[model samples]
Target: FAQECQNLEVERQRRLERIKQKQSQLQELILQQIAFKNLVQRNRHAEQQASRPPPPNSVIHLPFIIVNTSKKTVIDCSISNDKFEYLFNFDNTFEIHDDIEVLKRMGMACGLESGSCSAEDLKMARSLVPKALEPYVTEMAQGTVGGVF
Candidate 1:
């Protein structure tokens, strides 16, 4: 019995070590993906800046980047000239295409609503409870954001 218990402990320790190693590997992989995406964005912006004609009279070009990652189980999306500070601060979850408008902006930079709803309020609600696709984002925020949920 003593020998069997010792062997089991050794097996357990080995399994734990393997799990730790795998987690470390996954972290590295995720980091690499982020880095690669940044590189691609930089490359694209550089190309665009190079290709575009210079503006009239000493104008400087400030470039912006748009990146996407489906790896995240949840995403906070916003559309704005600002550095997207409002994205992660929302009280709700929206689908891949649907999204609310925060002021002058249109549909979310990324959400679940479809491209169909063109009106301003409808588009905003599209991000919330868009017709047939209403359940996706609405169900996600069932506890908050709306009294209906």
Candidate 2:
């Protein structure tokens, strides 16, 4: 019975670790969704207020990720004649960042990380997440940052 209990405890610990990892991934996805929605809302409001669209260069379309490399890096590319396919080879290492990171840097996460969001923004942020995950959002709103679970 003692051995069985020990095995069970070990299994429980393993499961807990897996759950924690999955929760973090879910939290990241939630942040991404909220940031994307907030960006869209802000752009919509700006366009409505100005009665004109934003400049082409000022706008960032959705469903895109960014790749960054040093200016000194050399990139080689190959393209098909039909333009349907292309390949890129870089001479130096580069970094890839998702849109959520961009949004955070742009302060589009409503300062959740900094816990500087207003009450209205907090409400909006909560509305963007699932019911069970709302408390995680609340923690973030309070500047707890990550690993709320």
Candidate 3:
């Protein structure tokens, strides 16, 4: 009876861990759906305000690495890759990019890099994103963003 009780206890721990794992997976899917909806809406609104169609290029390439410090293992590493392949691979079609690229693109569309973006243009950029992201936009316009790489 004592041995049987120990086996059941071990089984209980395994089941509990599996339930936690499944809940995490479901939570990730829900967040992905929310982000996809927001991106689609933003794109639709952007096209409406543009005088001419924006440039054909709307992709950003950033290098990344995945590692497990505790295990001292390098899971994977890749240099400069696209959104569809690097960031996330959903079966459905979707693209995610670093915020710096968006800021740089917006600045280019306004000719802000060659010339100067007005206070309103700067304000617009700040308004369109999270406050923490403003520095990347500033650095990008100043041609300082790529120095790290």
Candidate 4:
């Protein structure tokens, strides 16, 4: 009985870790969809307002991440000749933010996290995610995801 209890405890711990990892991955996908849709809408609006597309330099290329630190922080970096690898050392603590957070701060999440997104925006947001994940996105759009907001 002792052996069975220990094995079950280990199994439960392993499953909990897996669930945490999976949840983060799911959140990442949700953020990606929201950011992409927001970017698309912004460009469309800009083109309409000016009757012309934005310049290349004004557009942000997709699939990029941002690392930020205090202006006073000293950074040392090493790069590979092939541009495939980079190593950075910061003298002080720094933070990394994915593209989604950038868009959210730019008001690209359509206030979904704040529970103020309009019905039209909700529809658009739902369309950006997968069918199975649509309910999760809807919950987030309504700000019912609790701690996430």
Candidate 5:
């Protein structure tokens, strides 16, 4: 049972990680849209000017994701530019692709809604929730986390 719970958490976390990737893709799409629009406007402005102004700096999207893994058991996301001090909440209810297969695979006896675990198993399950998430999660809270520093 302990091992099963541990495995179940790993699967759950993997699903969460996958969801994070999708959210990032969505953010990238939005960022691109913003950049394209800004570019178009800048070009239009340049045409109106006697001479083109020096090239403007690139735009950066400061994005964030908030996961309410407790209570509603969902993630509420946001983004910002002046860091988290100013936020533009991302599309809420971004679908987390169903994980019924994972739940069934783990054999969650209490059913998907009720993730009741045995007392002993609870300890193992809680601990298995992946601490490695810390760095990435904290980074997202501020706006972004990615390959470069």
Candidate 6:
């Protein structure tokens, strides 16, 4: 009976750890969403709402971060070669980028590189970039969402 209680105690510790990690992960997602939303709202409130868009072939560079893997992959698909090299060359800080940075990379790839990212796909991709992140923001993961952060 003592051994049984020990096993249960160990299991409880493991479960608690998982829950804590999950909470951290969820917190990260929520912060990211809030940040992204603030960006979008600020953009709309600013010159983007009023300024006439630049003509095609004119390049506009914006600063952004890439957090989602799929968003990174989209820019990856758009670029010519050595995706990591390009990511590092400009923003060039970490192995993986935040989501907005990936969009900037894709824009660079589309404008500067030889190939083009389909406008339709790019539009759809933009929509998913945030949505994919939103669900994960709320995912509990384990039986109580406390497990598996």
* Best lDDT among the predictions, by candidate number: 2
Tens digit of per-residue lDDT, candidate 3, span 1-149: 99999999999888877876764453333323323434555677888995665676763323422222434333343445554444322333334554433434544223334325577755544454466655655653454533222
Q: Evaluate all candidate structures by whole-model CA lDDT and list the values in order.
A: 0.42, 0.80, 0.48, 0.77, 0.44, 0.47
C-alpha TM-scores of all predictions: 0.34, 0.73, 0.39, 0.64, 0.31, 0.41
Residue 148's lDDT in candidate 5: 34
What lDDT is reached at residue 135 by model 2? 79
Better of 1 and 6 by TM-score: 6
Q: List where candidate 2 sits over 4 angstroms from the true fold.
A: 54-58, 81-85, 113-133, 142-149
lDDT of 6 by residue, 1-149 (tens): 99999999999999888887877765545444444554555455764666976466774344544343433333332444766444323233335575544533534222211123366533432343367653443332112344354
Residues 1-149 of candidate 4: C-alpha lDDT, one tens digit per residue: 99999999999889877876776677567877787877887787878996867678977777779999999999998999998999999999999987778887776766665666788867767776779988788777655554432
For model 6, the superposed segments whose C-alpha errors exceed 4 Å read 54-149
lDDT of 1 by residue, 78-120 (tens): 7678765555533444333211122113323222222233355
Question: Deviation in angstroms for 45 in model 4?
Answer: 3.9
lDDT tens digits by residue: candidate 2, 67-118: 9999999999899999999898999999998777889888777777567789
Q: Which stretches of candidate 1 lie over 4 Å from their true place?
A: 52-149
For 77-100, candidate 5 gives per-residue lDDT tens digits of: 455675656433333343332233
Error of 1 at 51 (Å): 0.9
Q: Which sequence of candidate numbers ranks them by TM-score, best first?
A: 2, 4, 6, 3, 1, 5
RMSD of each: 17.6, 3.4, 17.0, 4.6, 21.3, 14.5
| Stretches > 4 Å off in candidate 5 | 50-149
Q: What TM-score should be assigned to candidate 1?
A: 0.34
Which pairs of residues clash in candidate 2, taking residues 3 or more apart in a chain or in different chains? none
TM-score of 3: 0.39
